[PDB]
Write a protein that binds this ligand. Structure first.
Ligand SMILES: [Mg+2]
Ligand SMILES: [Mg+2]
Ligand SMILES: [Mg+2]
Ligand SMILES: [Mg+2]
Ligand SMILES: [Mg+2]
Ligand SMILES: [Mg+2]
Ligand SMILES: [Mg+2]
Ligand SMILES: [Mg+2]
Ligand SMILES: [Mg+2]
Ligand SMILES: [Mg+2]
Ligand SMILES: [Mg+2]
Ligand SMILES: [Mg+2]
Ligand SMILES: [Mg+2]
Ligand SMILES: [Mg+2]
Ligand SMILES: [Mg+2]
Ligand SMILES: [Mg+2]
Ligand SMILES: [Mg+2]
Ligand SMILES: [Mg+2]
Ligand SMILES: [Mg+2]
Ligand SMILES: [Mg+2]
Ligand SMILES: [Mg+2]
Ligand SMILES: [Mg+2]
Lengths: 144, 134, 182, 60
RNA sequence: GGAUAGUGGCCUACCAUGGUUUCAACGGGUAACGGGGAAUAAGGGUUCGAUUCCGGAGAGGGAGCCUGAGAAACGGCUACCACAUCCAAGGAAGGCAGCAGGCGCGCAAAUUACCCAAUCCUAAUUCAGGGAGGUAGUGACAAUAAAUAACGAUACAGGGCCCAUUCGGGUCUUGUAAUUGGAAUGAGUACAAUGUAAAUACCUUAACGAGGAACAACUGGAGGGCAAGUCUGGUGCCAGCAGCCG
């Protein structure tokens, strides 16, 4: 009646059919192939430190006209280079050139969020201190 | 209206240790804890025994004050209490003295230093002295 | 390595966090009984859900089955001892009909309010929190306490408390000292 | 003119907003008192029965 | 036959050419130690399990071995490789994936603390010893209960009203006001005592300890999803916000 076999001794083909079909998913394929460890900028890592290389802003998409103020960071753990986004009104000036910055995920499962092209990472901490504490003047940059 | 009253529950004789074990249930309103020495004396004239063969510990003033509960023992003789109790209880009660022990770290240091030398160090000391002599 | 003793959660936040009717009902229950947070209602709902999972599991089992008898009457005797389930309905089918308000009602807060020694629910909460009410000569500084039927008759102000008869306290003692001095 | 100053100056609006000080704000009761206040304000002091509850009704 | 404590291609000598495999053998990968279990939960399941218990393996990677009943031990030796140390340049000594602590690594993890009180263990054996272990230090990993006010007497008010001469007493209650009073209490300090091997800490408790009870609760959000503003000022597809639509 249905495509799958139904006999009491058909466990083998049911199991192997499910096992072969599981590769059609994206989460299962990523988890089993281990693509996150090999190809992603961080291997199964929620956060990662890095060094600021330069200080660039990127224009937004079509329906949204602006320039989001990002920063190019070379990761210290392995040496990869990724653009990351500093999230707030006046936080670009807070981060200076060639300082250690702790990047985090951008919240969209390693994909570009909203209208910002070619970015996948936030900025949470700079030079050991957090952006949010600087933005509300609760702490200040050590300037070392 | 102080009237510290005392009770010994679950009392069991024990000539194996020549003792009598019990749990001390002390009812004391409008008052703090019972200051063990005083309750040791109370048990002393309670059980017709000297203040030396009586021990209490493990006290706990229950929540909200009033009642308190601990553990207590009455030994047949002062000598048996001397020869059966732990040293720290004999130090608490004044019937013994704290042993003049060096701290653990220094004891271990000296143990290793004694390890360094095979046999008595009487020979090596003079040997080293006459060694740096020349 | 020593054998652990098991910590365990006692509440469960609901799935839909912003249900308007549910939020209004939770605020109604918090204000009726002076609950500090809405975690209290979550805790009572979790207790009700555990009781209810047990009740439904026992219901699924066949009638006159040793498990059904033993655990069912154990649960009923425990609940009637708590007081939430009235003696009229010791049947294990009304046990599913208990509501969160029923367990809310047996809190020491609401019991002190009912007895009248606390004229307000928040007054009951503070009076409990100030180490005044003693459930059978034992001071209880804990609002919930799940007061049981066999011991509700023994709620009164503690002897150490000024209400039960003692020295008044800091404010009154200081004012008496000031009046005596001047 | 078209643009008063240099454009995209990394926090322009925050820089030029008027800094307005906080009000004196008498202490707000906290804990169980806050829940009692909410219960009184919503279920025993029903203010605007017409329409919805309309908590925070803008004055106009 | 040898070796084994002992069976066994475990090894040797001579023979036979065999054994596994589409019921997935063999090979490759495992950011794989296995399990008891954990999260999740209509039922079926999915993911995790380095770690409090049981097993296995390892002591930088490798091999080799003495002692014994028990080791291929490594806080036992021998040698090579890698990494190193003191050096009087002839030599000597190394093994933290033990408890501390340090460098490095990385988003990511603790004090060179006290002690054998408790659990036990070792020994000639009570007594000695035990960074096993327990106690404290740091510790918002998680988990439990729960303070941040409570009640009056007054002024500004709202609902059940005796009816409805307009009233209106508020007759009956419920809130809002920098008015105003009397209480209670800890969070902290602290005589003590309990606690503990000794001390903290908790339970109890002297004496202090609440008026703006400044002893002052934050973290996010207020277009929708999704509870709450089409209030005020600022900027004007800038700055920025926005998990998605915007
Ligand atoms: Mg542009
Ligand atoms: Mg591995
Ligand atoms: Mg495991
Ligand atoms: Mg595993
Ligand atoms: Mg591993
Ligand atoms: Mg093990
Ligand atoms: Mg080994
Ligand atoms: Mg190593
Ligand atoms: Mg031997
Ligand atoms: Mg070895
Ligand atoms: Mg070692
Ligand atoms: Mg070893
Ligand atoms: Mg050796
Ligand atoms: Mg270490
Ligand atoms: Mg240890
Ligand atoms: Mg950590
Ligand atoms: Mg701390
Ligand atoms: Mg506070
Ligand atoms: Mg806010
Ligand atoms: Mg916002
Ligand atoms: Mg706003
Ligand atoms: Mg809404």
């Amino acid at each position: 009646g249905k495509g799958k076999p139904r006999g009491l001794n058909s466990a083998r083909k049911l199991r192997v059919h499910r096992r072969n079909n599981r590769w059609a998913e994206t989460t299962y394929k990523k988890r089993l192939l281990g693509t996150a460890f090999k190809s992603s900028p961080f291997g199964g890592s929620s956060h990662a430190k890095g060094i600021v290389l330069e200080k660039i802003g990127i224009e937004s998409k079509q329906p949204n006209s602006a320039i989001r103020k990002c920063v190019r960071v070379q990761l210290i753990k392995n040496g990869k280079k990724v653009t990351a986004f500093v999230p707030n009104d006046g936080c670009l000036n807070f981060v200076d050139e060639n300082d250690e910055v702790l990047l985090a995920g951008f919240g969209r499962k390693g994909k570009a969020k909203g209208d910002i092209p070619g970015v996948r990472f936030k900025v949470v901490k700079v030079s050991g201190v957090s952006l949010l504490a600087l933005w509300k003047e609760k702490k200040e940059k050590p300037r070392s | 209206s102080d009237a510290i009253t005392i009770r010994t529950r679950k009392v069991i004789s024990n000539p194996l240790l020549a003792r009598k074990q019990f749990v001390v249930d002390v009812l004391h309103p409008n008052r703090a804890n019972v200051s063990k020495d005083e309750l040791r004396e109370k048990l002393a004239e309670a059980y017709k025994a000297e203040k030396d063969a009586v021990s209490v510990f493990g006290f706990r003033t229950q929540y909200g004050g009033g009642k308190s509960t601990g553990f207590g023992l009455v030994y047949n003789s002062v000598a048996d209490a001397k020869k059966f109790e732990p040293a720290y209880r004999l130090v608490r009660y004044g019937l013994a003295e704290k042993v003049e022990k060096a701290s653990r770290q220094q004891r271990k240091q000296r143990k290793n230093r004694g390890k360094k030398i095979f046999g008595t160090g009487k020979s090596i000391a003079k040997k080293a002295a006459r060694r740096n002599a020349d | 390595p020593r054998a652990p003793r098991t910590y365990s959660k006692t509440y469960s936040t609901p799935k839909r966090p912003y249900e308007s009717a549910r939020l209004d009902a939770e605020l109604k229950l918090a204000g009726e009984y002076g609950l500090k947070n809405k975690r209290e209602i979550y805790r009572i709902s979790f207790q009700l859900s555990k009781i209810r999972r047990a009740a439904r599991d026992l219901l699924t089992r066949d009638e006159k089955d040793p498990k059904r008898l033993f655990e069912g009457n154990a649960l009923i005797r425990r609940l009637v001892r708590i007081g939430v389930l009235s003696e009229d309905k010791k049947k294990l089918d009304y046990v599913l009909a208990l509501k969160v308000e029923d367990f809310l009602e047996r809190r020491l807060q609401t019991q002190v309010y009912k007895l009248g020694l606390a004229k307000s629910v928040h007054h009951a909460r503070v009076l409990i929190s100030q180490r005044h009410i003693a459930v059978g000569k034992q001071i209880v500084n804990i609002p919930s306490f799940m007061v049981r039927l066999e011991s509700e008759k023994h709620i009164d102000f503690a002897r150490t408390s000024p209400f039960g008869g003692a020295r008044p306290g800091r404010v009154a003692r200081k004012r008496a000292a000031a009046a005596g001095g001047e | 003119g078209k643009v008063h100053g240099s454009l995209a100056r990394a926090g322009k609006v925050k820089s030029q907003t008027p800094k307005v000080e906080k009000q004196e704000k008498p202490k707000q009761p906290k804990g169980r008192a806050y829940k009692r206040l909410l219960y009184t304000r919503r279920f025993v002091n029903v203010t605007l029965t017409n329409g919805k509850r309309k908590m925070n009704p803008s004055p106009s």
